[PDB]
Amino acid sequence: KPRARDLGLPFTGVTGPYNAITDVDGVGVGFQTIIENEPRPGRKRPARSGVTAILPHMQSETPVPVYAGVHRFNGNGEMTGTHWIEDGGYFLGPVVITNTHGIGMAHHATVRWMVDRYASTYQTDDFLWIMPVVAETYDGALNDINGFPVTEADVRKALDNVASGPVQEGNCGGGTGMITYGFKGGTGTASRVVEFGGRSFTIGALVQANHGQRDWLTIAGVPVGQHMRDGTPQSQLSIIVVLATDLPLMPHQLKRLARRASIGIGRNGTPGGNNSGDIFIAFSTANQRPMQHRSAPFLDVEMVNDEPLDTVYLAAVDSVEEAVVNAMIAAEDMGGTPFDRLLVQAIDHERLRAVLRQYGRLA
Amino acid sequence: KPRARDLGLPFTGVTGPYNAITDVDGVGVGFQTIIENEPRPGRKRPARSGVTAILPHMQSETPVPVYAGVHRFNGNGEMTGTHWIEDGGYFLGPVVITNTHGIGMAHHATVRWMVDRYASTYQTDDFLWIMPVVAETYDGALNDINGFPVTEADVRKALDNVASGPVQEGNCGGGTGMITYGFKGGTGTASRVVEFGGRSFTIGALVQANHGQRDWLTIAGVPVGQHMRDGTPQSQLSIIVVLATDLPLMPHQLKRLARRASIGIGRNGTPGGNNSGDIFIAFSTANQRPMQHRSAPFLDVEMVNDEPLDTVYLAAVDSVEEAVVNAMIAAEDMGGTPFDRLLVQAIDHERLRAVLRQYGRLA
Amino acid sequence: KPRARDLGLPFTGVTGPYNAITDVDGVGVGFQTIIENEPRPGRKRPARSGVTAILPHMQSETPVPVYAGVHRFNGNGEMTGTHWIEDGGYFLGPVVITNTHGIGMAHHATVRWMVDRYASTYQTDDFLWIMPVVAETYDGALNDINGFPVTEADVRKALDNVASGPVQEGNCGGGTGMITYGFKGGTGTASRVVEFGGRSFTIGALVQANHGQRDWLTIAGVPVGQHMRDGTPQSQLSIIVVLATDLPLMPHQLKRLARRASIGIGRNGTPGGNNSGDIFIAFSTANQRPMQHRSAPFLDVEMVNDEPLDTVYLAAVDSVEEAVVNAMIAAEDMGGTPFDRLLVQAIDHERLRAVLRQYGRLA
Amino acid sequence: KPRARDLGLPFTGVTGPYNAITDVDGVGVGFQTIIENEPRPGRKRPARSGVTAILPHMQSETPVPVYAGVHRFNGNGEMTGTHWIEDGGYFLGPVVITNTHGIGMAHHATVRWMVDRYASTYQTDDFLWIMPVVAETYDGALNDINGFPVTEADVRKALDNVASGPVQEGNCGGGTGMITYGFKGGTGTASRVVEFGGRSFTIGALVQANHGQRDWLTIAGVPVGQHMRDGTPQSQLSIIVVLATDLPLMPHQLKRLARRASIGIGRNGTPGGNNSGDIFIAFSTANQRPMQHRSAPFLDVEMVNDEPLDTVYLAAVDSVEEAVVNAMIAAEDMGGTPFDRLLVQAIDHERLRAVLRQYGRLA
């Protein structure tokens, strides 16, 4: 499986080792993918969905707070756990992404998993509560979303599968049944390394791309969507962005970094559709500390000066754009069975390359 | 059961009917209450929890958008469904309140119930998604919160039990296991009728009171907590506010109304604790309209002028204070079994009356 | 001049030495007070107004960033400089408070004063811009506000007069012509010392009180406004809160602290009027650092754990309530001339004491 | 003067008659431009600055509230008047744009101008206050910003000059001394006409472009900044966006519209620089009503459904992009005198055409 850079698309700077969000130290990604092409008993439509889990500091025996910031570009979607991100500045545990009507079971399963996995924290006499970050995009065109196919066991499998190294893209995890710009969408990831004050830090992005319309699609500045008009879902009948970094940032700086994903999604053409739940979260793995109930009264934290941040912002925007394009390149056709209303095609690599060549952007 | 006014407490203005949130026409409240005093098999602590459901336009055959506004006073808690309240301006379906780790099952159950109840809307070819408003307070001192006692059936029972009329208070629904100001807490409700542009409207409040410390408790402006010092949970070892009105208000005005609940909770003494998840939602039942996919492109709406709103703001504040006190008066002692760490007592009515009398505030 | 504690009002905890915002080391307060009782040439109404200036790190030869947070409880007023407080986390220079239509001249004068006072910073080749924090309340009932009485020289005088030590209250600075709860209002201040993690800190408040209606007035929990009904402004025909602390807080924590001023203003009875511009700013004097253009790329900062903050929140609430009541106790009758529409009286001390005594609250 | 479309750039959709913000009926624009090439007495650098004024409902004898919404993308700049836009939902009077240190005099001059212009509203016995919307970008590289060249008379001249019709672009009004993408910047405008529900509406934008670095510049998706590398300000040694529409939108909807300008400024390449004060305001001219003190208690308003808004969001993004490019095309070289540090050149039209032609984007 070539990724976008392999096809000659003219991407943007130096990446971490795997060109993925796992290039940020300690962050692991796990997936559970459900691809069925016949309905379950009592249903009329097949289940194509899944769960994505991103866990920071995956080696720690205790949950480690990660400072974080959210940006709600267009709130037509769900992302739980953000009230204490906004006021307390951090979250604990994994980011879990699934389909819109699997939020509940994913939230329930994640709390249960945290109580088991971090038993020495939560199965004690301390009064602690868990508020996980669970988010979604809507796969009802290709998935039997009102059949609630994702179970507790499916979400635990994603959490138990978290790992470092290369990350699968395309039709996997929460991205399985997604559609972006009229083509097959799904999971995408990328990373960038930047130098800041004599040290090297990584910015990694993971997206669940389910947004945009064909006409808007722009790849490398070329209006590809004006040239590749066939097979759109419309003719036959949301985006979650997670940014991770090891740069030492505080909450107020991370809310600014998350806001940069607005430009990041704009790069491939969308003006931000009304029905698109476009919600971005950014977290840092720097400044490790105990949970509130075990911390000393004063904490010493490192924080970056703001002056040099333009290169970090550029890296974040570029990583989001490459993560979206990687999802489209990695995706495969889906649908077209007797139980489907549509056939969603993955963007054709040779036709893409040809259009970019005509506009002098095929590297 | 006498309520606060029945004991001579010096409350504030004219109430609707039932002096409850059901005084706002069409708003129904349902409860599922779980009170056990012996552990379930494999658990060590008893289950004392439940679910509260508040459903606007409870007669409608289709979900009716209700404009709304949220105020996160201190975000150490969860309230789902707020991203589209912020950007879209409204929510659909019920407000469901339970315990912290019951969010996920309550969310899952609510989406499933909505798909069944509003089958003519959701079991169609339309691409529609549901993002319910599910909130919580933490009952881990009296409840086996990591045993996940609330099931899907429990939440469906609360939803199917919604009704107009008098509302049960104290140890019921989501407030079953809650503690407030070191005394037994739980569910409380109150309402006010106001005249605006001649016209008569109601403001009703429902609270799940689990906040505050004994030392802070102020009732009718009297420092009761300084006089009633025994039995605190501390010596032995959050608040969700929902405001409903039929006044015709738009989202930006409803956000201000919800922010008035900050002063409302301040009335009984709290300075707003760090660990308290204090999140308030206000919604109007005016301006009924179809869902987005069935609406005409232009809607005609009525909105109040802002000049005469002080009387509405005062009624909101007063109703929140009365609802909190009503919860304490309705509450009953809980705990003290061989499986408990604490015995939480309900505030004693005669002792309270005596303290108020000493400061000239017993009416 | 007795302050509220001197009259036997039952205030709250241990104050710093001056019981004022200048108890926070290095914070200076300066005033310019204009009290005229005949109209200036071409005007019909007299000028009663002024400027209040609060300067953190008043010894420093260069401007020192102070982390800060704002809460807009009801935005019917102006407070400039908040965009970079929200995103950047801090502000530089003084907080300047005046009347509503004097914002512009105060802003202009403050920039000019900073360019002259910090000449080694601003009269260089560096590209630097200044965005001062200038706020207001509306003194149109007692002041010729459309006569623009405050000049550049008036604001420079306040800035040049900043000093530590005891702070004047009542009819002075920006508070000169203000009215609160139908009585004469104005400037008030108070402070609290708290122990946090084996260290001592101070929380100081300064308020410009111009809010509330007589009927709502509550002092020490007693409904004083129901007993002292005469001479209201109505019968004859906003609040800025600044909190300063030396506790090491980051911006996300300071926004929470500023939000606690909502309860602080609720303590004296207001439900938060529609026309009241109720805007609060909290800043810390800890974590001194250079300006952005002179900072190293990485900074080391100290930050408190959030667990023990309840005593800090309680001190902040109590300090706001005391600063408001101090403002009413220090104020003097104003108006009643042939050019006035009103005569605004200060609350009478003996009548106040008598009402408190009847409810058992006169210490 | 050819504008961007006249040079063959491949712009986007149908414009209104002037392709400017004055295509929204009743919106006037007025400018005061100060271009001096020798220092004023006692100064060392020349003054090149000015004022831009945008007045909705310019014919009205009384101020007419216009619902509006703001998006602070990166708050390193000032825009006054936003607290009541956020909570009250509207503003009155003009949007005035100038240089960073001219805020104060522009604010003062606008309040004074409104008192005179709307004398039947403000020179009465009513208690009314004015909180104008005054914004800025920083022209310190080309202008003697610490000389405070803009006077009260300069701002009154811009206000008195508001007019419909064609709008001047480039080195005029507040944009006079601005620099964008290392080329001369300034004022730019554009409009789009869209059909919504059988009715025709216009979206217009006006920008004061002072943002970006040369290397990021992208025009029509082409990386022009990589090809036109000479004369950058760096080698020699912020953006305010105003969107106006006649679509009937409420405040919560206008906040989303103003958020779309983030994608609009990302079209030309910036990732959003840390030092860039990028603040956007959107307002609607629909739903005319009286001021709060003259309104009936209930108002009837028209509001759009959200479903069809994607075409409006696209029009908004495209108009911001065209306005920024129009500002660069209209700009003229500035500086390079014995008193300057730099010579800022306007982008060369022929060179730009040549780079676009090479990538197949010259229409």
DSSP string, A174-213: GGTT-EETTEE-EEEEEEEEEEETTEEEEEEEEEEE----
Residue of B252, B301, B305 with shortest CB distance to D87: B252
Q: Which of A305, A310, A312 to mutate to test the interface with C (most CBs of C within 10 A)?
A: A305
Q: In chain B, what residues touch A110 (CB-CB under 8 Å)?
A: 104
Interface of C with A in 248-307 (CB under 8 A): 248, 250-253, 255-256, 292-293, 295-307
Most distant CA atoms of chain C, gap in Å: 67
Helix, strand, coil abundance in chain B, percent, nearest 5: 30, 25, 40
Q: Which residue of B has its CA nearest to C276?
A: B310
Distance, in Å, from the CA atom of C96 to the CA atom of A295, rounded to the nearest integer, reads 38
DSSP state of C165: S
Do the chains contact at B72 and A83, CB–CB below 8 Å? yes
| Residue whose entry in the numeric block shows the structure tokens 């002096």 | B19
Chains contacting C (3 or more CB pairs within 8 Å): A, B, D
Smallest Cβ–Cβ distance between A359 and the set D73, D74, D359 belongs to D359
User: Which positions in chain C touch A248 (Cβ < 8 Å)?
Assistant: 298
Which chain C residues have a beta carbon less than 8 Å from that of D110? 104
CB < 8 Å from A in window 84-113 of B: 84-88, 100-101, 103-112
> Between chains, do B298 and D297 touch, taking CB under 8 Å as contact?
no
Nearest CA to A132 out of A55, A241, A49 is that of A55
Residue whose C-alpha is closest to residue D309's, from D201, D204, D205: D201
C-alpha–C-alpha distance, residues C50 and C343, integer Å: 19
Partners of D75 in the β-ladder: D277
User: Catalytic residues of B, which ones?
Assistant: 238
User: Distance from A152 to chain D by nearest Cα, in Å?
Assistant: 34
Nearest to B298 among D256, D299, D302 (CB): D302
Round to whole Å and give the CA distance between A260 and D69. 20
B283, B68 in Cβ contact below 8 A? yes
Consecutive H or E run containing A325? helix A310-330
Q: Which chains touch A (3 or more CB pairs under 8 A)?
A: B, C, D
Helices (H), chain C: 82-88, 103-117, 119-122, 152-160, 224-227, 233-236, 251-259, 261-266, 310-330, 349-358
Q: Which one from C49, C191, C238, C284 is the annotated catalytic residue?
A: C238
Amino acid at C363: A
Compute the CA torsion angle C286, C287, C293, C299 (nearest 10 deg). Answer: -170
Q: Which residues of D touch C82 (CB under 8 A)?
A: 75
Cα distance between residue A12 and residue A194, in whole Å: 12
**Three-class HEC string of B318-340:** HHHHHHHHHHHHHCCCEECCCCC
- Give me the domain span that covers residue D268: 1-363
Q: How far apart are CA D171 and CA D157, in angstroms?
A: 17
Distance CA D86, CA D131 (A): 13
Nearest CB among A296, A304, A306 relative to C88 is that of A306
Place of tokens 């959030």: C306
Closest by CA position to A258, among listed A243, A277, A278: A243
Give which of C293, C305, C309, C310 to mutate to test A binding, by max A Cβ within 10 Å.
Answer: C305
CB contact under 8 A, B300 and D301: yes
Query: How far from chain centre, in Å, is Cα B151?
Result: 21
Nearest Cβ partner for A298 among C248, C252, C297: C248
Residue found by looking up tokens 């109430």 in the block: B15
Q: Give, as one character, the DSSP assignment of residue A220.
A: T
- Subunit contact A292:C302, Cβ cutoff 8 A: no
Q: Could you give the CA distance from residue A79 to residue A72 in angstroms, rounded to a whole number?
A: 9
Residue type at D151? T
**Chains adjacent to D (≥3 CB pairs closer than 8 angstroms):** A, B, C
User: d(Cα D231, Cα D223) in Å, to the nearest integer?
Assistant: 17
Rounded Cα distance between C129 and B310, Å, is 40
Which residues, 6 or more positions from B61, have their beta carbon under 8 angstroms from its beta carbon?
Answer: B118, B120
Contact at CB, B252 and D251, closer than 8 angstroms:
yes
How many separate domains does chain C show?
1
- Closest partner residue to A263 (CB to CB) among D263, D275, D360 is D263
- Rounded CA-CA distance C235/C41 in Å is 30
Cβ-Cβ contacts under 8 Å for C36 (sequence gap 6 or more): C46, C47, C48
- Tokens found for residue A207: 């997206």
> In terms of DSSP H, where are the helices of B58-102?
82-88
Catalytic residue positions of D?
238
Of the candidates A270, A280, A363, which has an alpha carbon nearest to the alpha carbon of residue A319?
A280
Partner-chain contact B310 C213, CB within 8 Å = yes
As given in the structure block, the two tokens for residue B75 are 């975000």
Interface test with D, best of A71, A213, A254, A313 (most D CBs within 10 A): A313
Those of residues 204-223 in A touching chain B at CB distance below 8 A are none
What is the spatial distance between Cα A78 and Cα B130, in angstroms, rounded to a whole number? 10
Contact between D140 and D95 (Cβ < 8 Å): no
Contact D202, D34 (CB under 8 A): no
- Say how far residue A130 (Cα) sits from the centre of its chain: 22
- Shortest CA gap A305–chain C (Å): 5
Can you give the CATH number for the domain in which B109 is found?
3.60.70.12
Residue B28 structure tokens? 């129904």
Query: Hey, which chains touch B, using 3+ CB pairs under 8 Å?
Result: A, C, D
Owner of token pair 């039932």: B18
* Eight-class DSSP state of D219: B
CA–CA separation, D302 and C284 (whole Å)? 46
- With an 8 Å Cβ cutoff, is D128 touching chain B? no
Distance CA A146, CA A143 (A): 9
B291 vs chain D: nearest CA distance in angstroms? 9
Burial class (CB in 10 A: 0-12, 13-18, 19+), C111: buried
Nearest chain C CA: its distance from B202 CA (Å): 17
How far are the Cα atoms of B144, B236, C31, C152, C254 from residue C49, in angstroms, in the given order?
61, 56, 11, 14, 30
**Cross-chain CB nearest to C271 (options B213, B221, B263):** B263
Active-site residue (options: A49, A191, A238, A276)? A238
Query: Are residues B252 and D89, on separate chains, in Cβ contact within 8 Å?
Result: yes
Q: Which residues of A touch C308 (CB under 8 A)?
A: 297
Test the C interface: residue of D44, D90, D96, D108 with most C CBs within 10 Å: D108
Q: Could A266 and D266 be called an inter-chain contact, meaning their C-beta atoms sit closer than 8 Å?
A: yes
Angstrom distance (rounded) from CA A58 to CA A62: 10
Which chain D residues are within 8 Å of B311, Cβ to Cβ?
none
Cα gap A73→A54, rounded to integer Å: 21
Sign of CA dihedral A247, A252, A258, A260: negative
Type of residue at D318: D
- Asked if residues B185 and B334 have their Cβ atoms less than 8 Å apart, the reply is no
Token reading at C167? 């702070």
**Closest approach of chain A CAs to the CA of D93, in angstroms?**
29
In the DSSP assignment, the letter for residue D120 is H
Q: Answer yes or no: do B313 and C259 touch at CB < 8 A.
A: no
- Which residue of D294, D303, D311 is the best one to mutate when testing the B interface, meaning the one whose CB has the most B CBs within 10 A? D303
Chain D nearest-CA distance from A168, in A, is 28
Chain B residues within an 8 Å CB radius of D303? 298-299, 301
Is A238 considered catalytic here?
yes
Nearest chain C residue (CA) to D137 = C129
The two structure tokens encoding residue B134: 């599910």
At A166, list the tokens: 């290369």
- DSSP one-letter code for A166: -
Measure the CA–CA gap between C333 and B115, rounded to whole angstroms. Answer: 66
